[PDB]
Design a binder for this molecule. Structure first.
Ligand SMILES: NC(=O)c1ccc[n+]([C@@H]2O[C@H](COP(=O)([O-])OP(=O)(O)OC[C@H]3O[C@@H](n4cnc5c(N)ncnc54)[C@H](OP(=O)(O)O)[C@@H]3O)[C@@H](O)[C@H]2O)c1
Ligand SMILES: NC(=O)c1ccc[n+]([C@@H]2O[C@H](COP(=O)([O-])OP(=O)(O)OC[C@H]3O[C@@H](n4cnc5c(N)ncnc54)[C@H](O)[C@@H]3O)[C@@H](O)[C@H]2O)c1
Ligand SMILES: NC(=O)c1ccc[n+]([C@@H]2O[C@H](COP(=O)([O-])OP(=O)(O)OC[C@H]3O[C@@H](n4cnc5c(N)ncnc54)[C@H](O)[C@@H]3O)[C@@H](O)[C@H]2O)c1
Lengths: 827, 1038
């Protein structure tokens, strides 16, 4: 036997209210269907919902039974709204018609009704209180006082108009301004904020006030203008309630209200402190200072009132302003209130006995906070005649490190170190050509910095290919170092032939995979453009050049400027999704013009010309035929596959220079730079080679996605870099061919090891950043090749590619929320 | 003598209303201040305002004169609400108590009341019916039936609740959810739309319905659910009024309403057909099908009804449904009814006699549909005792098809359809092949390698400068120009190279290039002082203290690091030129983020010092010639410092236009100075034809930059006149000057004689100065800032000229940095207005978005208030956006404005500034004036950053601006400034414009923002009005 009594033997009782002009009923038909869902039997008195606009047909259909009056209160559960009284119709008190040990669910206010408690102790019954329910978090779904405060506030707002003779909203008609009404609200609780919301939505403006700090914040939340009192007091008593305030605070607040009273139109006071009367906040000399036609509502007329002038129940128009001072506000919205009050009981009755049919609710003396035993102890006022109204105490709980002088110091430090670096580059100059080349270098660097900045996340990899294609222009270093006859006779010419063979593949394949990374945007609704019109510069620029070689005009430098500006136009126009085709075409024209210019920059032997033509032709054919037969899903896969050659070509070119310039060294002015910069070029190209190989291998499923950690993870890179830097001292001005060539071999092999070590432990989710990083490195190899060869095109193009690739790597780090240091070095 | 009886001996009378349960009164105390400002005398019956809460003290203090009843009715004008009825308190008709041949103002309803018109014809009176006013476009302010319908439609909603049982709004309460209430409307007139507004703002569900097509659209603009029926008969009859329907349409409509009547809770029927009774649209068994507790409100209870169950003056609960069938809804809100009806009678009496004082008011017979004569003929029912109530037909009738509504930005989208993508691609591909032909042409003209290197560094400097100028803050364009006038002082480098001799100059060439150094050393010190005085006005007083003297640390590192590199025997001058060039690029690049501005000034100082020191060390003179150079530069810097610290900031553009002219002189005094000093080399040189052509072109460029700048000075200071001097043929003369200038290179070549070349130099200098004076004075005093900035480009290019001429590498990078800056500023200012550069320079008509003829005309009247409305309306507002113009700083009125804003943001308001790009006499001028007055830079917004906050804005103070707030830029396709991006100030709650009088500044004969009904004028001088606002804010807040 479970501890309780099943729901079939119990019955609830809904009487009508004999109290004066009471219109609401205890249960709606929405609440009669519940508890029949749960299991009770519902007995409803006949004339019960008629003032509440609930006909008896909904009660007969909802599961109840319309019956008399002497037996509705004689039920196991009596659910009223107001506490029982002396019935004048039957001549008997309503407690005398209750049964023995019944259950009553009502408003009680037991501290204000001693004799009702005595008469219910005579009937030896169990009484719960709807008004003693503690306001905790879990019990806010069943709070009768909050619901009645909400409806009373809405009723006061909707009742203020229909007596106020002007608008609340106000509009600029084309007939004159009408200004809005200005409403003041005293006391932000449940009624006041609901009033503020109903008034703010209707069109007026609100300037509410309360002594607490949270209610003012909620006025700011609802859109009100909270008032601030000068005297900085508190507003809290034993929790989040209101205490009786000091007289200095009262006379400051009344001065504030006397200031505000001359300008508002509707004053809705809702001040009420617990356990005492309502605070008087308005004098008769204070309230008569309003305009004629103002409407002034008090909602605390039950326990006194907020005014010196309130007849509780009348609408006497005291000196041209109306007092709305009813004490029964929810009774005028009985169809509304009897819903929410019914919802306040159903959610009570589902919670106190949360099972099939037992109806038990253990009333225990120990309770802490927030637990339902807290609610059960607070709610039950009488248990079997014996009164437990003083509830006990709650248990356990009732709830610039940078100092910005140093910013200016480090900024001035950066600029003064930069100006010293410019001076140090100036001191070590061999001739005028180096100074001129550093000038066009620095300008190309700034041009390359500013020229991306506007790309779209759809367009990271569709431009990288073009940079690949523009970094395919290492082939000029092969073109300025072949010679002899049709076959390459010397080993320097052989290395140059290898370089310009392997670097034609990059050009042809990079532009074709650009063309294939632009076809994957063309939806089948787009207007047919005309790309062949973009051939109109090219024959003008390449072929129109050739007559100048037929007319004896030696045009190479202005051609280099033209190809550099076309490459800038490529990178620029390929950055905003509308002009990507234009950028692709300008990159093609830039490469073609540069290679034709450097081709005419030798006037070679006809067999030598046939050699260079055959080498570039075979390289371009291979670069086409790889890039064409492949999928689409391997296009960003492919770029590193055509990037790995690129720096390798630079390495060969650097080595080629050291082989061609070694007999010229003994009687040389510019002798150190054409070894130091060649050494750095070898380093950069070798790292580019091995790193792009590891990039492709990690993207082609040869290796994993996991960064392969090592024991030596930065000692190892430190040792590689230390040997790499100390590889420049074994040719301190040495006359040996042998130690120079083995230094070149040493830095090449160690650069390969370094690229493997860096690009290995990365992870295939930052590898499209790493492609931009190596594509950024190769531009500096191109600038080194320019310094070796004294060629403006390679200097401009290399600086452009370098700064653009590095800035795109930074923007790709900006797209996600990572840095670059925590990405690369294994943070 | 003028035809009329003046207002002084013309009195009015306001009686108390005598009709049963009438609480309205015809004139408010707010309504008797007009008609007293207009000129009448006002007599009010002693108890007329007591019903609508108007105390008699407000009358007698408003300008009224309290009397009894028999003498208020025998007045020269009687103004009341209803028709004058039989007085019960003494049995006599109120037409008997009228003055003989007087005039009456009320509702009449003459067709329903000819018997009262008999009594009016016996007394030979003139009658103005309020109800018979035809509803035309110039008659919105005086439409009494619309106002009464508006109040009735609101009052029906607010009276339906307090009788309905539950919420309208509905929310998710923790006790449980409640659904919103359903409200049906029948017939969207004016009352139905007001009820729809009142129901939608309270959070309800509105599903109104009407026969006419546009009323359903206005429902769904108000947010209702506009219903429909499955039968298609056109509801409209003769006009905007409806008509009777077919019987079967009535059957289908009552079927639709019987289908939805079982669902809604509130229903308001405003169906009212003119000429006969209101249609019955609901049966009594149809309406008992609703829920128990619904509220049914009928607004047609007087003229029949929309229900067969409506008691015409009472509530009753018929089987659980309340029937609010009140016949006088506006008589319950007598205060608001009296105020609106008073406004209607006020605007009627103001509109009928627009004469100052005659009150003539003639009735005419032939009129156009819509004119005032139409309203006068349709309104006067009895004219001098005889009946003229059947109105004649409106001749010259419009409305064959009245639909244009062609907004401005629609036209350029239509023009975008002409731009077929073949032609887009083709016009893109022509520009690049033109550029590559330009590259090949510049290639062919190369004499050697060094010129090609100079072309390459010129092109890269141009791109660097182009990208770094778009990076600047839009709030710093005016320091920007000043620092360019600093950096353009590097023609001193052009001066010192050709400068030789001893303590004194020896030849004439050495004397020209000492004058060049002298007039260039003004620009350096002057530009850096005026940039320094401008950048520390942007420093807020709460900023961290700025330790700028640390930036002397790089300079002595660089420049002094040069000297020990010169003392030890090196040649770093080509690297010093690069270092100074990068410092000059950084001078604008750091001038981009408002916190590094003084950084970007000190870098300019370091670069100019390094460049001058580098050129000097490369010269290695005797200490006599070094002493001459030091004397020249110190004297020039003395004068440049001592004129930069004397002026005000608002006299800055003159100084800016003064700094260009000196550079335009200096290039001329450096080009000639090389043509003389390079003369014994021309026969034995290959580049000799190069350094002549450049030595031509620079003389042209400075030759235009000089003279025109003096005119651009001379108009802006006021020495020359503000009116553009137009010549009869000035297009032929300017083109002929340009033809002579381009033809002057033909004798300059092919003919190596000394005298014939120097006279070509003098010829091109003279004709270029004439070209500048001719083009400059024909511009106009408004568009003159364009001549400020475009010349700033030319002063750049002159620098580029001598960078090709002296084979120097700093001058090209600096000049390409400056000329790009001038070009981009001129482009921005020719975008901010929709004009083109040829339209500005050559003086065409209007903007580029100008269509053909007939711009639109104004409609409506202008509202003007005083300081007291102004201060109380400032006090109530909680978001103020201020748009100043040039007229603010023309009258020195920014000093009270900054104090006003500092006062109003202590109170807790949100006050900001919105600055149009061309407000002022210089790009970015008004930012500096507002920073001088003391506004922190964080509340000064541009046009693009603030133009979508005008709907969320209480009050906008337009100060001294007309064309930057003109609305016709976005509405009239024929206005003179259509398409110009403006401020959308009319999209807010209330607008104040402060100017002297209702006139124009430069164009736009009338601004249509002055007449929209939430625009208040505050005419007066801005100086006294703004500091009076300062004084009132101080006296009232303290
Ligand atoms: N800023 C530039 O760089 C630049 C460049 C090229 C062209 N523009 C021209 O500049 C124009 C600027 O137009 P905007 O809207 O700023 O001005 P606006 O349209 O020319 O009108 C200025 C207004 O200020 C009023 N005003 C003048 N002095 C006043 C004072 N002491 N107190 C009060 N009000 C005073 C004038 O009223 P009253 O005259 O009736 O007294 C006038 O209505 C543009 O339309 C453009 O055509 C500017
Ligand atoms: N879930 C929960 O437990 C829960 C939820 C919401 C609110 N609450 C509590 O319930 C209360 C909500 O307010 P209510 O309307 O129910 O109570 P209430 O009827 O006591 O409200 C009276 C209002 O008048 C204010 N007031 C009191 N003395 C004043 C004075 N001298 N001057 C000006 N204003 C004065 C009070 O601050 C309050 O805003 C708050 O105390 C809040 O902490 C609890
Ligand atoms: N630009 C203009 O010309 C303009 C602008 C605004 C207003 N106006 C005038 O003001 C008038 C505003 O209307 P009002 O409120 O003064 O007149 P009203 O109160 O008589 O309107 C009656 C309403 O009931 C509707 N109705 C008529 N017969 C019906 C039927 N059988 N069933 C259902 N609905 C029916 C009408 O369409 C109208 O919406 C317009 O009709 C027009 O003449 C004109």
């Amino acid at each position: 036997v479970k501890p309780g009594i099943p729901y079939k033997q119990l019955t609830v009782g809904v009487p009508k209210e004999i109290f004066q002009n009471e219109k609401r009923v205890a249960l709606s038909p929405a609440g009669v269907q519940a508890l029949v869902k749960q299991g009770f039997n519902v007995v409803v008195e006949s004339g019960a919902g008629e003032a509440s606009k609930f006909s008896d047909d909904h009660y007969r259909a909802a599961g109840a039974q319309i019956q008399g009056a002497k037996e509705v209160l004689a039920s196991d559960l009596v659910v009223k709204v107001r506490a029982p009284m002396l019935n004048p119709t039957l001549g008997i008190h309503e407690a005398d018609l209750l049964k023995t040990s019944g259950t009553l669910i009502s408003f009680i206010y037991p501290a204000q009704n001693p004799d009702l408690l005595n008469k219910l102790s005579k009937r030896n019954t169990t009484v719960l209180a709807m008004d003693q329910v503690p306001r905790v978090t879990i019990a806010q779904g069943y709070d009768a006082l909050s619901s009645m405060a909400n409806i009373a506030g809405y009723k006061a707002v909707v009742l203020a108009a229909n007596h106020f003779g002007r608008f609340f909203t106000g509009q600029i008609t084309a007939a004159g301004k009408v200004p809005p009404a200005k409403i003041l609200i005293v006391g932000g609780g449940v009624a006041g904020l609901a009033s503020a919301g109903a008034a703010k939505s209707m069109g007026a403006i609100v300037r509410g006030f309360d002594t607490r700090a949270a209610a003012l914040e909620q006025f700011k939340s609802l859109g009100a203008e909270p008032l601030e009192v000068d005297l900085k007091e508190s507003g809290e008593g034993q929790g989040g309630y209101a205490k009786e305030m000091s007289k200095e605070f009262i006379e400051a607040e009344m001065k504030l209200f006397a200031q505000q009273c001359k300008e508002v139109d509707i004053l809705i006071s809702t001040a009420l402190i617990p356990g005492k009367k309502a605070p008087i906040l308005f004098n008769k000399e204070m309230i008569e200072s309003m305009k004629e036609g103002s409407v002034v509502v008090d909602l605390a007329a039950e326990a006194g009132g907020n005014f010196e002038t309130t007849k509780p129940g009348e609408l006497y128009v005291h000196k041209g302003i109306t007092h709305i001072g009813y004490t029964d506000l929810p009774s005028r919205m009985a169809t509304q209130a009897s819903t929410l009050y019914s919802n306040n009981i159903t959610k009570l009755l589902k919670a106190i006995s949360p099972d099939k049919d037992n109806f038990y609710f253990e009333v225990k003396d120990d309770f802490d906070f927030g637990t339902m035993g807290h609610v059960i102890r607070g709610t039950v006022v009488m248990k079997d005649g014996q009164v437990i109204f003083p509830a006990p105490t709650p248990k356990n709980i009732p709830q610039a490190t940078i100092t910005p002088f140093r910013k200016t110091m480090t900024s001035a430090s950066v600029y003064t170190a930069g100006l010293t670096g410019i001076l140090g580059l100036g001191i070590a100059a061999p001739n005028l050509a180096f100074s001129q080349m550093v000038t066009t270098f620095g300008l190309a660097g700034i041009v390359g910095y500013h020229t991306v900045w506007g790309v779209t996340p759809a367009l990271h990899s569709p431009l990288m290919s073009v940079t690949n294609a523009i970094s395919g222009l290492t082939a000029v270093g092969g073109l300025v170092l072949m010679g002899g006859h049709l076959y390459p006779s010397t080993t320097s010419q052989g290395l140059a032939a290898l370089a310009t063979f392997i670097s034609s593949v990059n050009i042809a394949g990079g532009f074709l995979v650009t063309q294939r990374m632009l076809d994957m945007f063309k939806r089948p609704t787009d207007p047919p453009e005309y790309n062949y019109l973009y051939l109109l510069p090219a024959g003008t620029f390449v072929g129109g050049y050739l007559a100048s070689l037929y007319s004896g005009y030696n045009i190479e430098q202005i051609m280099y400027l033209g190809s550099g500006l076309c490459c800038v136009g490529a990178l620029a126009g390929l950055s905003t999704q509308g002009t990507a085709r234009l950028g692709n075409a300008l990159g093609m024209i830039g490469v073609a013009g540069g290679l034709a210019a450097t081709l005419g920059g030798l006037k070679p032997c006809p067999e030598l010309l046939a050699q260079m033509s055959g080498a570039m032709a075979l390289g371009g054919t291979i670069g086409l035929t790889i890039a064409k037969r492949i999928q689409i899903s391997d296009l960003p896969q492919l770029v590193a596959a055509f990037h790995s050659l690129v720096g390798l070509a630079a390495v060969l070119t650097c080595i080629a220079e050291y082989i061609i310039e070694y007999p010229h060294f003994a009687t040389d002015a510019a002798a150190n730079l054409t070894k130091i910069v060649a050494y750095l070029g070898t380093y950069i190209g070798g790292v580019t080679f091995s790193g792009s190989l590891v990039a492709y291998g990690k993207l082609q499923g040869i290796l994993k996605s996991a960064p392969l950690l090592l024991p030596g993870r930065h000692l190892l890179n430190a040792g590689l870099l230390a040997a790499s830097v100390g590889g420049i001292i074994p040719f301190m001005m040495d006359p040996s061919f042998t130690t120079g060539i083995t230094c070149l071999g040493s830095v090449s092999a160690l650069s390969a090891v370094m690229g493997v070590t860096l690009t290995a432990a990365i992870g295939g989710a930052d590898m499209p950043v790493v492609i931009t990083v190596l594509n950024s490195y190769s531009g500096w190899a191109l600038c080194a090749e320019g310094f070796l060869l004294n060629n403006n095109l390679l200097t401009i193009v290399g600086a452009l590619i370098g700064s653009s690739g590095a800035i795109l790597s930074y923007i790709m780090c900006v797209a996600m929320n990572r840095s670059l240091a925590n990405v690369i070095l294994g943070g």
